[PDB]
Ligand binder design. Sequence first.
Ligand SMILES: [Mg+2]
Lengths: 89, 88
Amino acid sequence: FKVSHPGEMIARDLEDMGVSGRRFAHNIGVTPATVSRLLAGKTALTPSLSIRIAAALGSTPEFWLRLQSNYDLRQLENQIDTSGIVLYG
Amino acid sequence: FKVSHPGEMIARDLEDMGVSGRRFAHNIGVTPATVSRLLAGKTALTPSLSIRIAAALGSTPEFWLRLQSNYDLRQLENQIDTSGIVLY
DNA sequence: GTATTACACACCATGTAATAC
DNA sequence: GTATTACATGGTGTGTAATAC
Ligand SMILES: [Mg+2]
């Protein structure tokens, strides 16, 4: 059904702090268009965004980027067929 | 700590097994141009390839994809100017 | 003050096909 | 048998600016 994207987690941290999407965008050096797209799931949490987010929300850049990597794998593992691929010895 | 391209590890695994580029390409479902580009470091190890690579080389898609995430971040650690952001 | 989104643009991974050993 | 690369192309992340509250 409807799945959860890593933008929802950025949003809950901003709501808990009373920081709007427009100040958060200006803070990380990005226009508010991208933050709205990010938080809604329209676009992906790129590695460069995981670097600014890490400097604003206080975790490792790998942490925020991992959320997008797992999101991509959860989507693609249902789509890519691996029956024809041979495991080597 | 040294961050090589993910293709260098894939290249050494294929060399140790006798598998060529075209053979490995045919196994996972991509053209030999893709495997060449991947091994030379010209292109990135996408999440799609990480699933195909783990089916042939036998680790996890998270493993192969995390090698590329560490490469991409390390290249961007030195370029993104983070001295203007305030921590909450 | 706040958020959403079409548009133009730029970046990039991949198949095709020609190249070379 | 092997590997490499220019080209066309589809995909997509982002700023600009419009729209709306
Ligand atoms: Mg084509």
